[PDB]
A paper describes a structure:
[name], a model member of the Membrane-Bound O-AcylTransferase (MBOAT) superfamily, plays a crucial role in D-alanylation of the lipoteichoic acid ([name]), a significant component of the cell wall of gram-positive bacteria. Through biochemical analysis and cryo-EM imaging, we discover that [name] [name] forms a homo-tetramer on the cell membrane. We further determined the cryo-EM structure of the tetramer form of apo [name] at 3.42 Å resolution, and [name] complexed with DltC at 3.50 Å resolution, and in complex with an inhibitor m-AMSA at 3.23 Å resolution. The tetrameric organization of [name] provides a scaffold for catalyzing D-alanyl transfer and regulating the channel opening and closing.
Significantly different from the monomeric crystal structure of DltB16, our cryo-EM structures reveal the tetrameric organization of [name]. Each [name] protomer in the tetramer is almost identical to the crystal structure of [name] monomer, with a root mean squared deviation (r.m.s.d.) value of 0.4 Å. In the image processing, application of C4 symmetry to the refinement and reconstruction did not yield better resolution map, indicating that the [name] tetramer adopts a non-4-fold symmetry. This observation is also consistent with the following structural analysis: Four Phe36 residues of the four protomers form an approximate rectangle on the intracellular side, while the four Tyr22 residues on the extracellular side are more twisted. Each tetramer features a central hole. The central hole is surrounded by the transmembrane helix TMH1 from four protomers, which is almost perpendicular to the membrane, with hydrophobic residues Phe18, Ile21, Ile25, Leu28, Ile32, Phe36 facing into the center of the hole. As the tetramer is a dimer of dimers, there are two different intratetramer interfaces: the intradimer interface (A-B interface between MolA and MolB or MolC and MolD) and interdimer interface (B-C interface between MolB and MolC or MolA and MolD).
Residue numbers in the entry:
A (entry chain D), B (entry chain C), C (entry chain B): -3 to 415
D (entry chain A): -1 to 415
The structure:
């Protein structure tokens, strides 16, 4: 009964998800049948499972391929605790039972994020996309609590949670929208539109991830970081250079992956949510969060921010609505900071963006009352000319790049600050 | 460049039939056109012949490449002794001529299974599928005897006997059914259903052979064998452990191969017989043999068991039907053991399964008699509760595991008896 | 001037025609637009020229790439001496002008086949397929002489004489049939049938040239020749073995090339004449020549044998028809041997097959008169059964293999010279 | 490290250098052609292909020209939109000249810097000689009012056109937009495909066979012999003149046919550059066949406009003198565009004097033939000998002009440069 099982699942192929461009050959061929079936309004639901599982396994068979075993636990864990809650939802509905089931479903993510802090080493039950899978699972539990979701077969649950195109770190879905878009196969014209969009997305993702991302990450970023460390001090010009370069590199890499995921999802007939829609032209933090990682930000607005606001207003803990909104903004942004990983700089980034949103709300209210005062006094309202827009875009870009500098983790290297 | 032809044959590539998963890619592409051809009403004879011969040669070459020659002669032998009977079938059917033709058809198998016993090491005639090929050949000499087969060209004969997805050790087939199933190409929707079933079979075979068969074969079996040998004695708990582990490994490996073969056959538009249908849950041995190796068990039921019962009743050797049935069961299982190989443990396995079958028949008769006795006495019949079903399943499973342990040959190493 | 263009010609890319399976990928990709255009009843007549010229150049750019220059002379020769007849043909029909034009058109072939005998070195005009282009370039003139051929554009001439699929050494065409097949594009059903036949031919050509031809030529033939030379003497068993092996190798290589050429021609929409149709079941010399290199044998029957018979009968040189037929057979076979090449063994092969045809005609006449005599005398006609047919097949096969032994040129090494 | 050396690291694919480049281009352009078959445009795959091939053609040993290209693109966009915003209000007849000068400023700097101290400017790149002609086009078409609206996509798609980027045929805006927006039907598309295949084959023949023979086999030894003999003139001078002229034609026509074929595979038929020029009887009819795109461009936007400017100011008394001056100035400006050296300007002035002499001879011939018809004498016959004489003299003058333009006359002599 030797425990050489880890060695068994290590010589398997390691086809990287969106690695070399030739990958899109294999997947393309593997997606040739399913897409054809969509033209005839027929869904295989078996060959799709085969291709999804094969590509997930090829993606997860890395140097630390043992993570596959974690998956074979994680899935089971979710299947244990989602369905259990459903059984309870058949009989009764209590706040504490829902809280316990949600906490148990999100527990693997909590362990993966916390264990490197306490023990200092990666947790056993960690794999490539556990930061983007639990968001589906807990989401379904939430959809049970509100009563929107009542019944679903296991095939639907597993084909939703373990979606291949958006598995590693991709757009975050919900169960209602995904299921409704999976049941009703779109007609031929919309299918052809989606095919054209998918080809365009594949080409754009090639450009983003294989040209711009490589240039900004593996060519300028290392020498810029080394020069910044050599300069030393609290701040310097190389710090600004690395801030801007890393911000652009992060955006380009994430947008390239998102385009790849959207293209592959379209090739299966499903319209996954978009992530980035020109986020750097944003002229305000609130508008920025409607552009940067749209799936994640919208998910947190739907399930973490709005529900917290409702809870706070139900108990009327805070008198004015503005104070409740500010508190909920800070809590939501801090929690979003936690999701990346509980360190000093990720939590700093979360609180930073929370403070930014609070300042944005305060400035919106103050601008409204100042416009009212000026209009009442006969003066014209504040100018909306190109100069004001340029100033707003510049301020937003500077704040976003400062946030991406803190989030970059470069402040741990520049300043050896333990906490 | 060649030296001896055997070395040149060894030079040829060796592709294990259903070995690495990558193998399924090759056949997949090799089966891509033909399957599409099944959608329409045409079949590519030349392509099918070429792909079948190519994969047969690839499976036959390797360290024992000379076996290819043993195949070729064998083929001629069959063509020598099948068609001859056909000509004789045109004139008359004397029993002794039919017996002689059947014996000459199955003579290569007799020599292959005899030569290792009674001195010697191994016969030159032996090759990969010789154990599962004569069943097809003697599958026609019998049918000619019954008169249900009259005409067939060489193309049909060799296309059936040299079937590629069922060559190495696959679901034993019959001629009439195979010809009737290949003459009529199935419709489009049935073809899509067959494609889905083939994909499910491929996935399940992956699970059955490359995951669980590996675990039960190369992880637990060697340590359990070592512990059992170290313990010694007539028997011990490690013997029970190795019995259970080997039985599971054998079932999983055989089911994986059979599902692979059925999937590849379905991709060729032909529905080969199913070998395994949920064993280990059978209440009775007689109902176990309708689920374990279904193709071979049904073959022996049709062409060996029932025919022998007819022969015995024609000469009315025994007084009652029950004795004839018992003797037929014993002879059928003994012939199965002989087909497996003429050793001590294979014959022990055959005799033990025959004993199980006859005891099952006797117990069924006794239970029917006692139920009649209770019915005529007014007493409630013996309970058929879930506990009785569990008891029957447990007894059948234990007997099957013991039979597999005997068939393993591990008992021979353990005891060294009858060496 | 420098004269270094030959060196330039040696740095062009090289692609052996039907050399590798990957060559068919390029060929199919290039010919797909032509097939699609055929499906819609359209011929580009320019893209075809481009693909044909590119593949001819890639085939002719071997180690002796200078042969390309010879082609750039040969065409400029043939055109000059084809149209020179066409202008004259409209005016008058003097026999000597036709003889002179035919001789001048066949002159490059005469030089290529003669110069290696006189000077001992390859002639300048020689290139890959002159012996299979002079036939078309003299068939055009012969058709002009009969008056069957009339006004035709240069495009038709150059697309007929320089046909890409049958350029190197392929099926020999005529102009009228090829032109009529080129003008009338076949319907969609015939196009599908031709595509299926072409795929079958490609697979069979793979089997013949890349498997059987290699085995019979590069593996057994050199050892057999070496052992035959070591044995020495006028005749020996290794010589018989190498005779049979080389006969099979020659047939398989030529049939593989012919099937490749037929497939590629079918992909262009025209069906070139077949070359081999089971030559080794001939049962007679006449039925052998109606099966062995059918395009060449039929060409020589149409334009060399029949015309010679007509010439001899017009002047009634010989008293009876049989003498004229025998003389024409001998002359035709000697001229075929000449066309192969002016060596002792090629002329021996030609005159040998001529003697064979003569004695076959004598045997047919004697069998006819003997059957008549036996029928008149009441005796049964001589049997025509399995054994008689087998004896005829054996005699024909032995004579053909002796002919291919003489034609092999092995006699020059064994009998004459020293080794 | 990302530097100029990093730009030099990128692969270099010389435009229309080897047939494998054509295989690459055909494989890349096939989807665009099939899409145009069904009357749709991608506007993204086209941009990616164009940018990729431009970069590959630009990433040579001196690959620092991509920065020059980016600076040129920014400069052209800035000044074109500056004029467009200004044209909406009013035209002052001098702001147009200022904008035209600021648009041609990169070109004039690139053509002046080599001949001022020692070297070309840093902003020079591959196709700057054939790109400015498009930019000024826009400005010209804004002055006449025939162009009013265009987005950035159309403008950059027209200026950064891939098939005619390096030295391909010079286009105009209005025609290019009219041809791009209206995709041709299926049958005309097939005809264009056949013409493109014919162009590819003929370009193969022109550039990869004949140009190689006339450039690498005869030109070096002929130049060597001409230099060895020396003197003002010699028979090897005539040999090198003829060989260089044939090499120039068989190379430029091959490249132009390649560009036209690649453009046709993208559904746009760029203007034909060469239509058998050597058979032209007269000098004036020669310029309608040799470098047709460039000659027509200079006829439309440089010659006729200058004639109009001179006539509206009535500087000269009669039309003939104005036409002569316009011809001389047009040919001199073409010579300047080629490069500011002694032999390019000599070539321009020589072609100008050829044009004016041709005009004068045509007028004199018309007058003398009118007098002959009045006097009863039959007009001079032209069936086979007069036409041959005209063709021969035009060909001789063209060959001499090409010899002067060759720059070999500079090596042969040591005249003041
Ligand atoms: C009704 C009132 C009239 C008032 C007077 C009108 C006068 C008009 C003057 C227009 C000046 C335009 C200035 C921009 C073009 C300069 C052309 C030039 O110099 O040649 C170029 C060659 O041509 C081109 O590449 C583009 C030519 C087209 C220019 C079109 C601009 C607008 C013209 C409109 C009116 C045309 C009048 C005649 C223009 C020559 C580029 O130079 P190069 O590299 O050959 O070097 C020569 C350099 O100047 C010497 O150092
Ligand atoms: C449904 C049909 C389609 C399903 C998928 C079909 C395509 C499957 C491709 C499997 C092979 C991928 O081929 C790829 O080759 C590369 C480069 O050699 C290797 O790549 C990998 O090698 C080994 C693991 O094998 C690792 O140590 C290494 O880090 C990694 O790069 C692997 O062998 C495989 O990842
Ligand atoms: C330490 C905390 C982090 C630093 C925080 C910095 C971010 C603060 C907010 C960003 C600046 C917002 O400042 C200013 O906001 C106004 C008011 O909406 C924006 O103005 C805009 O508002 C909205 C768009 O959302 C429109 O309806 C309005 O017409 C337009 O003028 C300006 O574009 C921006 O210049
Ligand atoms: C490695 C082992 C190699 C040995 C295997 C060799 C391949 C098997 C050869 C089979 C015989 C080929 O010769 C065969 O002759 C028979 C004569 O009826 C015909 O056979 C035909 O029979 C059926 C009857 O419906 C046709 O539908 C079919 O198209 C074809 O198979 C063909 O002409 C040819 O297929
Ligand atoms: C080699 C040594 C022996 C090997 C084992 C022998 C075979 C296995 C034990 C005998 C079979 C056990 O299973 C036996 O058949 C079935 C299945 O539960 C039960 O009985 C079943 O069949 C009888 C037939 O009369 C029905 O009336 C009854 O309703 C049904 O439950 C028996 O009560 C049980 O005793
Ligand atoms: C629409 C038209 C389509 C045209 C089809 C494509 C034509 C061009 C094909 C690719 C170019 C030729 O590709 C060819 O590849 C072979 C690989 O064996 C190489 O050529 C080789 O030829 C022989 C045989 O293989 C070798 O012995 C030799 O050493 C080498 O020159 C060159 O790389 C090139 O000659
Ligand atoms: C319209 C035409 C339809 C048929 C089109 C497709 C048929 C041709 C397929 C070509 C497949 C690839 O072509 C060839 O395949 C062989 C098969 O082992 C492999 O390579 C083979 O040839 C190469 C070179 O000759 C050898 O070095 C090698 O040992 C051998 O295996 C490669 O994969 C590729 O060189
Ligand atoms: C240097 C000489 C080279 C030539 C060598 C020999 C060339 C071969 C030709 C010899 C004849 C063989 O062809 C001959 O055909 C005749 C008539 O069809 C048949 O002749 C045979 O069959 C007939 C019945 O048909 C019977 O009378 C008898 O059994 C026999 O004559 C045989 O098929 C074969 O004997
Ligand atoms: C080698 C260096 C290359 C430098 C960069 C070259 C790329 C430059 C991109 C120019 C286009 C940017 O311009 C922006 O693009 C979008 C999206 O394409 C255009 O959007 C649209 O424009 C045209 C206008 O008819 C449409 O036909 C087209 O479908 C679409 O592209 C907008 O008009 C413009 O807002
Ligand atoms: C470097 C200095 C300049 C070099 C020379 C440049 C001019 C070269 C051409 C000079 C001759 C003009 O060429 C002349 O063209 C005219 C019309 O164009 C042709 O035709 C004209 O003359 C013929 C003479 O028979 C008459 O029919 C009629 O007057 C007219 O048609 C002449 O056949 C040709 O001789």
């Amino acid at each position: 009964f030797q425990g050489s099982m880890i060695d068994f699942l290590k010589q398997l192929p390691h086809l990287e998800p969106y690695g070399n461009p030739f990958y899109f050959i294999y997947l393309g061929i593997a997606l040739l049948p399913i897409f054809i079936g969509l033209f005839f309004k027929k869904r295989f639901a078996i060959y799709e499972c085969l291709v999804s599982i094969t590509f997930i396994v090829l993606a997860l068979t890395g140097t630390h391929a043992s993570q596959i075993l974690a998956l074979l636990f994680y899935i089971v864990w979710q299947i244990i605790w989602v369905y259990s809650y459903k059984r309870y939802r058949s009989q009764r509905d209590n706040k504490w039972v829902f809280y316990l089931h949600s906490f148990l479903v999100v527990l693997p993510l909590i362990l993966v994020k916390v264990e490197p802090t306490i023990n200092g080493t990666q947790s056993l039950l960690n794999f490539l996309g556990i930061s983007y899978l639990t968001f589906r699972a807990v989401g379904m539990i939430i959809e049970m609590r509100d009563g929107v979701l009542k019944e679903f077969t296991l095939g639907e649950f597993l084909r939703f949670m373990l979606f291949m195109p958006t598995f590693t770190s991709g757009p975050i879905d919900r169960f209602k929208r995904f299921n409704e878009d999976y049941q009703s196969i779109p007609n031929r014209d919309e299918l052809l539109n989606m095919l054209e969009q998918a080809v365009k997305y594949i080409m754009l993702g090639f450009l983003y991830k294989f040209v711009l991302a490589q240039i900004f990450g593996s060519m300028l970023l290392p020498p810029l970081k080394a020069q910044a460390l050599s300069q030393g001090g609290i701040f310097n010009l190389p710090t600004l250079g690395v801030m801007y370069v890393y911000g652009f590199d992060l955006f380009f890499d994430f947008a390239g992956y998102s385009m790849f995921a959207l293209a592959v999802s379209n090739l299966m007939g499903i319209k996954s949510p978009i992530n980035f829609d020109k986020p750097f032209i944003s002229r305000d933090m609130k508008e920025f969060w409607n552009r940067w990682h749209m799936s994640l930000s919208f998910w947190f607005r739907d399930f973490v921010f709005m529900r917290l606001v409702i809870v706070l207003m139900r108990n009327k803990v805070f008198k004015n609505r503005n104070t409740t909104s500010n508190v909920a903004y800070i809590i939501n942004m801090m929690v979003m900071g936690f999701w990346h990983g509980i360190t000093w700089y990720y939590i700093a980034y979360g609180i930073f963006h929370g403070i930014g949103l609070v300042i944005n709300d305060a400035w919106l209210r103050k601008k409204k009352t100042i416009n009212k005062d000026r209009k009442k006094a006969g003066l014209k309202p504040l100018p909306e000319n190109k100069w004001t827009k340029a100033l707003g875009i510049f301020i937003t870009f500077n704040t976003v790049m400062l946030s991406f500098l803190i989030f970059s983790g470069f402040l741990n290297d520049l300043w050896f600050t333990k906490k």
